[PDB]
Every structure is written in C-alpha cells, then in structure tokens.
Design a protein around this ligand. Structure first.
Ligand SMILES: CN1CCC(C(=O)c2cccc(NC(=O)c3c(F)cc(F)cc3F)n2)CC1
Lengths: 272, 219, 232, 337, 58
C-alpha cells in the first residue's frame, strides 16, 4: 500500500527540491558575483526568480494533488494556486522569448544596441513580461463563473473557444513563433560569421536551448488545446498531470541549459 | 553605532563609489586598441592619417563608437613584464611596412619575430590581431626593383604585386600557432583616408559579435 | 578660498527671504555646508546642515520646518529659503565649510556673515566663566564640559574649539580636542577626558583676544557654548 | 681591451672566494634548533571592494590604518582599513599605473607607470580636492616602483635600468643611480632611510647609498628576473623574489646567499615580498592565485593565504604588524589578521 | 665605445672588493636575536585578543 505511492511522492518531492536549490544557487551566483553583474544577465536572473517561485509555490501543490486527489487545502487557495501557476508559466515562456530577443538584438546591432542595453532596458523588459503574463491568464478566470468546488477538483474546464484560443496562441505559440524566428536569424548570423568543428558545437547549443523548451511545453500545451477546443473526449487525468509535470520540468532544465554554457557562470559556480 | 560624522564619511564613500561606478561604466563601452610595430613602419603617419616620451593615447569617434588607441612603440624596454597589462585590449593593430627588406643591420624578419612573440603570447590568446600593411604605393615599384627572394628564399611564385602581397600576408598569417582561438585580419591602408577607419570598425564590431555569441554559448 | 553670502536687510515678522552663499576657491561640489547663527549679543546656534550632493539634510529643533536648505553645484551657490520669521530669528548668519573623513578638519572655514534683523534631549554646553582677564606672555586654561561623555566607542573625542576675533569670522583652533587646525599659530594645545575638556594656551600674545566657542559634534542637533571672552 | 675583461673576471672570482670563505655554516643549521612556528591561521577580515580593474600596487601609511591602491581603471583610492570607507578617489591623467606609495607624513601620495611620469598628489589641499603637485618626469622607461624617502624627496625606479632620487620642489633628479644590466623593477627603503635596495631583470640585487650617490653592494644568485624585494625590519637584511619560483634572503653584513625558500609544488613566479614586524614571518605573493607564508628562519611553509581568483600583485604589512593587505588582478583587496 | 663600460664595470668590482666581511653565523645569530626579542609584539606571529584587535567581526 504505502510504497507504491511513497516512491512517486519521493521522486516528485526530490525533483522539486533540487529544482529549487538549482534556482537558488543561480540567483546567488548572479547577485554575489560582480563579473556577472551586467545587464545581459538580468533577464536570466528574472527567469531564475520565476523558476524558484514556481518550485516553491505551485510544484509542491501539484505534488500533494497527485499523491492525494482530494484538494484538502480547500477552494480558498485553489484560485490563488491556479493564478500563480498560470502567470508563472506564461512569465517563464515570455522570459525565454525576451532572452531570445535580447540575444538577437545584441547579435544584429552589437554596436548600436550596446548603448541601449542598460539595466533600465532589462527592467522595463521584465516589467512588460509580467504585464503580459497578467493580461494573459485573465481569461482562464472564468472558473469564478459557474464554479464546481463541490467536485473537489482544482483544475479548470473553460468551455469557450475563442477565449482559450487567444490565451493559447498569445501564451505559447506566438512566443514559439517569435523564438524560432529569432533563433533562426541568430543561426544565420553565426553561419555568416563562421563561413565546421565549432559550428557543430554552436548547432548543438542551439538545439539544446530550443528543444528543451519545445519538449517541455509543446506536448502538454497541444493537449490543452485539443482537449479544450474541439475534442469531445478527454485524456486521462494521470496522463494530463504527467504532461503538466513535463512542462514544469522546464524550470529545472533552464538553469541546466542557460548559465551552464557560459565561462563566467562556470567560474562563479566554484565560488559557491 | 556610528558617530555623528562617521555616517557622513560613509555617505561620502557611497558618493565616491557611485562616481567611480559611473566612470567605469562609461569607460567599459569605450573600445581599447593596442598599436604595435616598428618605428619606420608608418605608425606615426598612419595614426595621424585616420585621426577624426612614454605611452601615447589617442581618441577616435566613428559611427557613435568610442575608441582608445594605445601606442607603446616609443617604450624601449624589455617586454613580457609590462605587456600583460594590455590583457583587456579588444584588438591589436600590428603595423608593418612592406618596403623594409632593403635595410640590413632585414626588418621583415624582425617584424615576423615580433608578430610571433605577441600573437602567440599567452596574454593575447583570445585577442584579435589586425595587420595594417603600409607603404603599398612605393612597394608597387620596390617589388619590381628587387624580388622577394632577397628576404624570402623559399618564394617561387611570379614576381607580381598581386602575388607578392598575397604571399606576404599568407606568410604573416602562418605564424599564428592557434588558428581557432584568434583570427588575424589583413589590410592595405596607407595612401587612403577612410578605408582604414572602416576596416578598424569592421574588425571591432566583428570582435564584439564574437564575444556576444561566446557569452551566449555559441562559441 | 572665499565665501560670499548676501540677502540680509529688514524683514517684518512673518515675512520671507532667500539667503544665498557663494562658494569659490574650493571643490564645493564635494564639500558639505552648515549654517550657524549668532544673535546680536548671544552665542552661536546651529541652523541647518546639508551633506555632499544633498544626500542628507538636518535642521535644528528650534528651526525645523521654518527654513529649507538647498544647493546648486553647477552654480557653486548655497541657498537657504526662509519664511515665517519672528524676533527670535534675528541673528548673524554664517556660511560654514566642512568635509567629513578621517583626518579632515570640519568647520575649518567660516563666512563673513550677513545681518538679517526682524522688525519688532539636546546636548547642553557649559563653560566655567563668561570672561577672564589675560595678559601678554601668560597662560590661560579654558574648561568646557558636556552633558554626556563625548568619547565615542571608536576612541575619538568629538570636541571642536573656535575663536572669533572682534568683528571677524570665527576660525577653527582645535578639532577632535587633540589635533591642531591648519594655519593656527600652534600656541594652542587641547586636552580632556570623558565629559571634561580644557584648552591650554602657551605664551598668549596679541591677536589672541576674543571669545572662545565650545562645540560638540557627537550627535545632532549641534550645540554651542555661551562663549568665553578673553579681555586684555 | 681584453685586459679589462680579465681583470673583471679575476675580481668576480675573488668576490666569490670571499663569499665562500666566510660561509662557515648555513642558516638552516643554526635555525633548526628553534621551535617551529605553528600553522598561522588568517581570515579575510575586510574585503575592500570598489575597483573595476586590475590591482598592481599598494602601500600602508605610517598611521597603520590608511592605505592607497593603484588600479588600471585610472583611479587612486585611499581606503580606511578599519571602516573600509573611501577616503579619496584621485582621477589619474594616465590610466596605466604600475606602482603607488603613501608619504610617511601622510600629506602626499605618488604613482606612476607606462606614462614615464611620477605624479605627486596632495592629500591636504586647501582647494579640498586632490590635485597633482608636480609631475616628476625625466625617466626614459616605465616606472616600476616609487617610495617616499622623505616628505620632500622621493626615490623612483623605472624600466630604463636607472634609479633616480627626485626632489619635489626642484622638479629635477638630484641623484642618479646606474649600474643595472637590466630594467630595475622593485625597490625597498631601509628603516634608517640611509640605504635602499633594488632588483632588476639581470637577476641581481643592488644596494645603493641614499646620499653618496654611488653603488655599495651587489647580490646575485637568482635564476630568473627579480620582481619583489623588501628590507628586513632590523634593516640589516632583505628578501628578494624572482620569477624562478624561489625567494631568497640576503644579509647586508654577511653579503652572500643566506637562505632560499622554495617548494617542489611551486612553479609560479613571485610578485611581491614583505616582512612581518618581528621578521619571523616572510610573506610573498605568488601567481598561483594565493599567498604563502614562509618562516624567515626555518624556511618552512608556516601558512597559506587564499581567496583571490587571480594573481596577487601587491601586499604589505602594517607598521604595527596588526594586519597584512593583499591585492590581486581581480580588483579585490583583502586584509588579513 | 665599450672601453668606458668596461672601465666602469672593473672600477665597480674593485670598489666592491674592499668592503666589510663577517661570518654567516654572526648574521644568523643577529637575525635570531631580533626575531626572538620582538616575537611577543608581533600580532601575526601569535593571535592577539579580539578586544585589542581592531579588525573585529562585523
Ligand atoms: C496545470 N497547469 C496547466 C497550465 C499551465 C500552463 O503552462 C499555462 C500557461 C498559460 C496558459 C495556460 N492555459 C490554461 O491553463 C487553460 C486551461 F488549463 C484550460 C482552459 F480551458 C483554458 C486555458 F487557458 N496554461 C501548466 C500547468
């Protein structure tokens, strides 16, 4: 009886704890080290902060949900958990998009964009990312209308096509199209600079930085579209939460794909 | 715990720190360049051309980009103990005159040795080297007067300006023992007014692009 | 080094004025400024203090709100906007130069002063005698006491001694009670202990006649003694 | 002409024979008896941050509380070792500084480098802001070390193989010291101010007379360039550092190689050498990103100072011996005690 | 040209030839005596009490 659920509980709790620790060490390295204290890393710092917030707020709640299907905490916190999860996921996606935009700007206008690459620019970019993550995630609050708290279930069934279509496109696909276009342009610039022993390394780095996000979010996100827009059937709840945790895994992967292929971060991590 | 004006001293320290940080941020954007070469390699003439007893500093402003050029040719002292201070130089301008074969005390061998010494120096592994080959206008007829065999015995190609310059720049580039870590630019500048500035700007922007790609993880 | 302040005259009670102090001959952009006022027949009284770059500003409890202090580094001028005046505010106003750091000499320079007449927990400084006769070639000891010990935990004693010749601006004689101020004749020699301090003069001569002001700088508001006038 | 070479060789051989004659016993034999000094534990009491460039030189004031650091950022910063407050930030006309020193009187501070000019700054100006008093130029090589002989006169070492004593008010080199085969890098002043010793890339240390204006004594034995040199507190001996990863102590009276400090696992060069107040502890900076404490008598590794992420370029012990500062190319200064 | 340099070098060596000369044992004894005499007043050699040390904990 106990071991079957206990193994899952432990392998989820340890994953969440290690994600939190990896985010914390990244934040400590960024704040502590002066060599890394330049505005190019402020977007990554914001991304790490969002990942830490996810791991400390929503992931443990999802773990207690999966281990025990009853939302014992009550509806009083279901709404705030939903809001935090939704806004933090959107904020992480938009932070990856903004990091891609900063890199593209720095590789296309390295002599012009350098002057405008001040801490103020990073701060305003982060604020706009949060503002978009707030504007998005608002339509899904239709759960407030026609509530189903008696079901003892904290997930949301929305039942409205165009609204979820917008909150879907603008939440991940528009960021997806943006990041693909920008990384394609960056790869073109790198190819034009190279012209391939290192070109292979650059291609591997791009493949990692893109495929991590793609594998993390595309499956769960397309499931959430197909099930909620037109499909009359539904995917198994256990499978759906597996895709949700796969998406959450992006928080752990980001520190292991960002800041790992950087000499400054490699040197800084030894200090901690 | 602090006394009445101990807090004032702390505030003054914070003000000084803020001013120093502002000055450092302003200076960081400025590009730093090192000018090396022989005295007769046209260093003075060339540095005067593109201008828009110890080390000499010059400031340029081209397309909203600030430059810092350091001339240390006049410093007649042993190297390998003061050159390391230039570890942060974005790029090194190595000026060599194509017309210095006829003088023997032979300057071509000295210039090649100097290029080998600095380019392969452990402090300049990641730095980019720009080779500004001057005196092309009079080299045009100096090559005709005497062959490259006077200085390069292994030379066997046609004694033509286009082939001679190509062989010279290939030989200069061959000295680099690390091809991947650094790239050596080559250009013929003297007898021109804006092409040298354009080439310097292209080299520096390429270096910045490479640095951005490297700290982005693509190098 | 020169300090020029102006903006005096006759002000009716409850009126307003804009005093100014011009800074020249020194790096005013980094030096702090203090305002100390002397009544027509009384001692000094601290008014306001503005730190370097306007980072920190202080006012005395008896002048808080009534006056506001501002500075303009590009113009090398110090401003003191003042309003709601009363008869108690009639007093000479002095522009004071000070820089705060280890080994520095705060309050080392004082302005000529401007005459502004109004139409009709703080540390208390105590002095032994109001006036003491003196003779050339003799030695005179002036004792000053503070309500609380001026010896801070760092080991420095925060005592400042100032001399004002009749009709001239005061100048700093002894700072920290142990170090001689720059340009002093070197005759003076300060000493003291916890809550007890004294000023010793060796071979008093001409130009030493005046009133000696005792000051404390351990905690704001800054306070001044009643003064001790040496008479020949 | 060959007669001069033969005479020089004979004189050198006679000098070596004289050195050997008085080498009755080595310092190790006599110092083996004294009890060893236990592992000296030190911690970074203060981390004086604020520099955005490499640190090359520093000096402790006679008050044993204030110190000045020279960096390539173009700023000279005077620090309060107890409170870490920034006393001053002097903007240098030339950012390529290589050495700096604090006047014993505390009213002056000087620095120099590739600019070939010894700048003298006033720290007690009536104007309020620190300004250059007089630019003591004249050297034809980059400055490598500057030390204040007195409040009104200084001694400078440059890369032109010459050490010059400069008069502040006059603005001219009153005395010139020559005789080094290579560029002279480091220089130390004796406690009595009567003698000073300098080292050059010629692998030899020269002792000069402050007032006589003539060479007094020469030392050899280093296998590579000399980088650091400092007087023993008694003033009758001095330790010299070289790029050959060895530190050697020479006594002026003994006038011969007294003791050499080296370890198998040390291959980097030495950039700075300083002595403790009692002279029992020898502190030398190394390019392996840490400083090692050497017992001046037993020549044992008494301790290791670490924490810098780059080469340590400068270090000095307070006149009272309370703490020793360390500076490295990472723009960080650490005080140890 | 080299005549002057050779003359200066030989003169310097000759001047250095006639100088003071003592045994190394005397220098070692003097260094040991200096180290032992001032050992008690070297804070680095022996840790001093935290109260006397100005570099106390923050
Ligand atoms: C468990 N949790 C689910 C979504 C989280 C996420 O990444 C995310 C981010 C932005 C928008 C969004 N959309 C919805 O949640 C949604 C929905 F679940 C039903 C609808 F009917 C409509 C919707 F919009 N989801 C990840 C994990």
């Amino acid at each position: 009886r106990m071991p079957s659920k206990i193994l899952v509980s432990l392998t989820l709790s340890g994953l969440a704890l290690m994600t939190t620790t990896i985010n914390s060490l990244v934040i400590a390295a960024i704040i502590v080290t002066r060599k890394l204290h330049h505005p190019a890393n402020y977007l990554i710092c914001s991304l790490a902060v969002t990942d830490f917030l996810v791991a400390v707020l929503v992931m443990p709640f999802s773990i207690v949900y999966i281990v025990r299907e009853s939302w014992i905490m009550g509806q009083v916190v279901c709404d705030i958990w939903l809001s935090v999860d939704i806004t933090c996921c959107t904020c992480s996606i938009l932070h990856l998009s903004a990091i891609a935009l900063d890199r593209y700007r720095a590789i296309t206008d390295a002599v012009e964009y350098a002057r405008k690459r001040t801490p103020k620019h990073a701060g305003i970019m982060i604020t706009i990312v949060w503002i978009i993550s707030v504007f998005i995630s608002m339509p899904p609050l239709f759960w407030r209308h026609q509530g189903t708290s008696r079901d003892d279930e904290c997930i949301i069934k929305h039942d409205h096509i165009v609204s979820t279509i917008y909150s879907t496109f603008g939440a991940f696909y528009i960021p997806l199209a943006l990041i693909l276009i920008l990384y394609y342009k960056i790869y073109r610039a790198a190819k034009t600079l190279y012209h391939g022993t290192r070109e292979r390394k650059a291609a591997t780095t791009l493949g990692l930085i893109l495929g991590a996000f793609v594998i993390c979010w595309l499956p769960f996100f397309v499931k959430e579209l197909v099930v909620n827009v037109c499909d009359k059937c539904k995917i198994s709840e256990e499978m759906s939460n597996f895709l949700a945790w796969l998406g959450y895994l992006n928080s752990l992967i980001n520190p292991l794909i960002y800041t790992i292929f950087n000499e400054d971060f490699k040197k800084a991590f030894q200090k901690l | 715990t602090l006394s009445a004006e101990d807090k004032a001293a702390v505030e003054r320290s914070k003000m000084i720190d803020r001013n120093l940080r502002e000055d450092g941020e302003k200076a960081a954007r400025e590009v730093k360049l090192l000018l090396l070469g022989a005295g007769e390699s046209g260093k003075n003439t060339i540095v005067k051309q593109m201008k828009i007893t110890g080390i000499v500093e010059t400031h340029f402003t081209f397309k909203d980009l600030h430059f810092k050029m350091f001339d240390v040719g006049a410093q007649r002292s042993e190297r390998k103990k003061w050159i390391h201070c230039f570890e942060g130089v974005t790029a090194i301008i190595f000026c060599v005159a194509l017309s210095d074969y006829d003088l023997v005390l032979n300057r071509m061998h000295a210039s090649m040795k100097l290029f080998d010494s600095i380019c392969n120096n452990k402090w300049f592994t990641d730095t980019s080297i720009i080779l500004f080959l001057n005196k092309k206008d009079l080299f045009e007829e100096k090559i005709k007067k005497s062959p490259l065999t006077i200085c390069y015995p292994e030379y066997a190609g046609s004694n033509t300006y286009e082939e001679a310059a190509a062989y010279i720049q290939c030989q200069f580039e061959d000295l680099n023992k690390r091809k991947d870590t650094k790239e050596i630019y080559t250009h013929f500048t003297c007898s021109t007014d804006t092409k040298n500035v354009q080439f310097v700007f292209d080299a520096v922007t390429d270096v910045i692009i490479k640095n951005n790609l490297k700290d982005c993880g693509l190098f | 080094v020169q300090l020029v302040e102006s903006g005096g005259g006759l002000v009716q009670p409850g009126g307003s004025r804009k005093l100014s102090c011009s800074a020249s001959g020194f790096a005013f952009s980094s030096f702090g400024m203090h305002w100390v006022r002397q009544a027509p027949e009384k001692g000094l009284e601290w008014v306001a203090y503005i730190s370097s770059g306007s980072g920190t500003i202080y006012y005395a409890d008896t002048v808080k709100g009534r006056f506001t202090i501002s500075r303009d580094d590009p113009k090398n001028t110090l401003f003191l906007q003042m309003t709601s005046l009363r008869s108690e505010d009639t007093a000479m106003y002095y522009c004071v130069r000070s820089i705060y750091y280890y080994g520095s000499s705060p309050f080392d320079f004082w302005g000529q002063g401007t005459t502004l007449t109004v139409s009709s927990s703080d540390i208390v400084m105590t002095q032994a005698t109001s006036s003491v006769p003196v003779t050339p070639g003799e030695s005179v000891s002036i004792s000053c006491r503070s309500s609380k010990s001026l010896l801070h935990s760092n080991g420095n004693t925060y005592l400042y001694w100032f001399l004002q010749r009749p009709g001239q601006s005061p100048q700093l004689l002894i700072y920290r009670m142990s170090n001689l101020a720059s340009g002093v004749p070197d005759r003076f020699s300060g000493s003291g202990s916890g809550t007890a301090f004294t000023l010793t003069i060796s071979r008093l001569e001409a130009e030493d006649v005046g009133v000696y002001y005792c000051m404390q700088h351990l905690e704001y508001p800054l306070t001044f003694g009643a003064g001790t006038k040496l008479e020949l | 002409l060959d007669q001069l070479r033969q005479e020089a060789e004979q004189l050198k051989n006679q000098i070596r024979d004289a050195r050997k004659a008085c080498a009755d016993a080595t310092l190790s034999q006599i110092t083996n008896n004294i009890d060893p000094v236990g592992r000296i534990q030190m911690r970074t009491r203060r981390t004086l941050r604020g520099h955005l460039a490499k640190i090359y030189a520093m000096h402790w004031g006679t008050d044993s509380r204030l110190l000045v650091s020279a960096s390539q950022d173009g700023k000279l910063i005077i620090w309060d070792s107890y409170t870490t407050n920034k006393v001053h930030a002097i903007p240098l006309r030339s950012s390529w500084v290589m050495t700096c020193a604090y006047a014993p009187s505390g009213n002056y501070v000087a620095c120099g480098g590739l600019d070939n000019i010894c700048s003298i700054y006033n720290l007690k100006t009536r104007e309020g802001n620190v300004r250059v008093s007089r630019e003591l130029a004249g050297h034809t090589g980059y400055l490598s070390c500057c030390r204040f002989l007195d409040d009104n006169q200084i001694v400078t070492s440059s890369g032109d193989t010459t050490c010059a004593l400069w008069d502040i008010e006059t603005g001219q080199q009153t005395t010139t010291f020559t005789g080094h085969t290579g560029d002279v890098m480091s220089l130390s002043l004796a406690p009595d101010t009567r003698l000073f010793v300098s080292g050059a890339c010629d692998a030899s240390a020269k002792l000069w007379d402050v007032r006589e204006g003539m060479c007094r004594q020469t030392f050899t034995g280093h296998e590579s360039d000399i980088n650091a040199i400092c007087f023993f507190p008694n003033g009758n001996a001095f330790a010299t550092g070289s790029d050959d990863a060895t530190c050697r102590l020479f006594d002026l009276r003994a006038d011969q190689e007294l003791m050499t400090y080296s370890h198998d696992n040390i291959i980097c060069g030495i950039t700075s050498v300083s002595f403790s107040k009692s002279g029992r502890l020898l502190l030398a900076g190394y390019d392996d990103f840490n400083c090692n404490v050497w017992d001046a008598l037993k020549a044992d590794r008494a301790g290791v100072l670490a924490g810098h992420d780059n080469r340590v370029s400068c270090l000095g012990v307070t006149d009272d011996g309370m703490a020793v500062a360390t500076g490295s190319w990472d723009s960080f200064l650490k005080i140890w005690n | 040209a080299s005549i002057a340099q050779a003359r200066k070098l030989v003169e310097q060596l000759k001047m250095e030839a006639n100088i003071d000369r003592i045994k190394v044992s005397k220098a070692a004894a003097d260094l040991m005596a200096y180290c032992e005499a001032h050992a008690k007043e070297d804070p680095l050699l022996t840790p001093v009490p935290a109260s006397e040390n100005p570099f106390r904990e923050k």
